[PDB]
Design a protein around this nucleic acid. Structure first.
Ligand SMILES: [Zn+2]
Ligand SMILES: [Zn+2]
Ligand SMILES: [Zn+2]
Ligand SMILES: [Zn+2]
Lengths: 212, 212, 221, 208
DNA sequence: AAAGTTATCAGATAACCTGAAAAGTAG
DNA sequence: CTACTTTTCAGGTTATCTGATAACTTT
């Protein structure tokens, strides 16, 4: 009652996931039915279906209808990097410099990939940015949502997200003119000028924050 | 093969993920009673309760039985790993793209930060690449180890940690090739920032036209 | 809702009907037999086995127990909307995104062509509508005719076929006030009595761009 | 050979549908009661209930079951490829004029990379057969389909494909490209424009 | 305490799988 | 004859429904 007791849903997982690394149901073998896990665990259809997604999501098992479920990686390959907000020098310079290659290379694609509706998102976004130059406490979201728009303009369904993450880290006129420059570059459909003024927008930012 | 379709379950989590990434549901913020999300996203709670779990496993929300679902993150369990496979040579190509973008500045930021053993690794396998110009199966464990150098030469783990993972799951699912593998060695080892970015891009983009 | 990502069954035919129309299975040819077809697209026995019979009612090919299946045509028994399903909101939001652009031109032709016989029913049904913004259910029987006879004002029986079909399934589809609805309806008529192509093109578009905004609002309400 | 066990149901069913038994909006009995009302295999049903879907009497949610949506089927024909040409065909050409109008516009606000793929490749499959115009018809076939696809709308592109299934070059291409670059520029109203000139012209070429 | 969420059980119907037993025609 | 494909059975798991019940927090 008092503390978040592990409900069955989660409990059933750590039973099964153990076996994936305890060696029982080896890699590529077929997990049992659901009707059996119900019996094996005295739980119900509903609970089973839920727990299964715990394993698909942590990337240890997959499924197709009718076949059942295939195990993949005993560990569970749920692994990437980059935190957000906790300051620790030079390792910080290992990341911004990375996005410099990234923020520029993305806008270099939108120079061949922005359409009308893409600009319409970047439109009110920078329009929402210019409307709070005196209030920089609101334009965070849009400094993202504008930076965001360059990824949405990349039309790369994957690339988009990897960017989409990076920004969601924690943390006036000199800040905003580096922006509308890459717009008149993305507006133009200009390849390297978008790859530039973007890299330069972050170029100044990464040393301006090293001065913070 | 065909593109593996998407369940309601995971299309729900992805579109709710974005609804978290666009800060519509910020941290501390409870989430709509799923009974509304059924009506909103159109399904029945069967899939709701499932998609729910996909999150609480990728670590984006928690819920307490009684007190609704609460958001507390915008980062994922790890980052994001496309499963790729036969799913979309398109969404797969949505990476060869970026894996070369990275490899643009990657060869570059080595050319300004290339050590001895860096280039002395770039050469050790460069010899084992030469003789194995007639062992096109022994010379496999070389081409990556080659590109690895550039990445390890960056002295930037994030940058380096990132690409390995990309390269890694990429291969999950020599004459003109080695000449093309070569043109960057003169580029990295001669202080040329963009010429390293230049002939390296020439590499993978030929190989992609070698594959596509 | 969202994109009811299709059944492999129908995901298949909509590559095979396309493959047929790609001519790569030029008519009179025998399709690669079932054994092959699973592996080509990567599906099971009862998918092909099904997606086949979709072509045997769509009539694209005929099958003979032993010979196999021979493409006998590249066009079906007509074109068909193929939707109106519960939970097909992305499929439905793909419907309205056409009858619109249609009912924009289905005013332009009516703006360039007409009798009074068109403007007969036009003022007739709008009158049958104006006097009946009070029993919001009987007037549904007339939003047909106004929209219907607006197409009749175009004088193209194959246009008139198109709309009446699409219109058919939406009435079947949304198997669930009248003032701001009746206004926009008249707004088309004004640019069509005074006869104006590009003026009625918009005001018609606005009707659908407003009546569907009073449809994507009640579903999530 | 008589009618298949499969069809022996489809045209046994449409009766009880059109005989108001399985009235519209009612749930079709489950794919287990049918084999148990009929004495066939449950794996027969899947085809029968695949006929009635493409025959537009029903659709089904993967849990609720199957529900009829018509009592006969409103197929909605538009047959022929020639004869009675006069302007009856030109009225068809009048229709498609607006669809080619609306469609290209929708390519300009949401085209993608896979869009400019064959749209540039069918523009390239066409430009190299300008003096072999018995070959590029298959491309003027497909080049439309290409941008027709860029709608991402199943039905839009799709029911456009069927018309091109009813039966100089240095010019009609200049109209093919003016529309092309519009979506290639993302200008939607210019997309709806630079297209139909192509369509207004080949039909003016009714004179044939 | 009662209104309102999450979590779980009870009972069920459509997709999609795998393989063997019929029923046929192209060799 | 064998060998190739088509239509059927039988026996199977997954997705996704829809209803109630249970445990718990909110108000
Ligand atoms: Zn910024
Ligand atoms: Zn190589
Ligand atoms: Zn109306
Ligand atoms: Zn043409």
């Amino acid at each position: 009652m008092l503390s978040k007791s592990l409900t069955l849903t989660e409990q059933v997982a750590r039973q099964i996931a153990g076996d994936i690394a305890e060696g029982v149901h080896s890699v590529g073998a077929k997990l049992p039915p659901g009707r059996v896990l119900a019996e094996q665990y005295g739980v119900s259809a509903a609970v089973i279906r839920e727990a299964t997604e715990r394993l698909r999501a942590q990337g240890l098992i997959q499924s197709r209808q009718g076949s059942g479920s295939v195990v993949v990686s005993r560990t569970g390959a749920q692994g990437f990097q980059v935190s957000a907000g906790l300051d620790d020098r030079e390792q910080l310079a290992s990341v911004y410099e990375l996005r410099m290659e990234l923020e520029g290379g993305a806008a270099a694609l939108a120079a061949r990939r922005r359409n009308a509706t893409d600009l319409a998102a970047m439109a009110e976004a920078l329009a929402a940015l210019e409307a709070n130059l005196d209030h920089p406490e609101q334009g965070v979201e849009h400094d993202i949502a504008f930076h965001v728009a360059i990824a949405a303009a990349t039309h790369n369904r994957y690339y988009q997200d990897l960017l989409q993450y990076l920004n969601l880290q924690l943390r006036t006129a000199v800040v905003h003119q580096e922006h509308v420059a890459v717009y008149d570059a993305i507006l133009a459909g200009d390849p390297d000028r978008a790859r530039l003024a973007a890299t330069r927008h972050l170029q100044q930012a990464a040393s301006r924050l090293r001065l913070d």
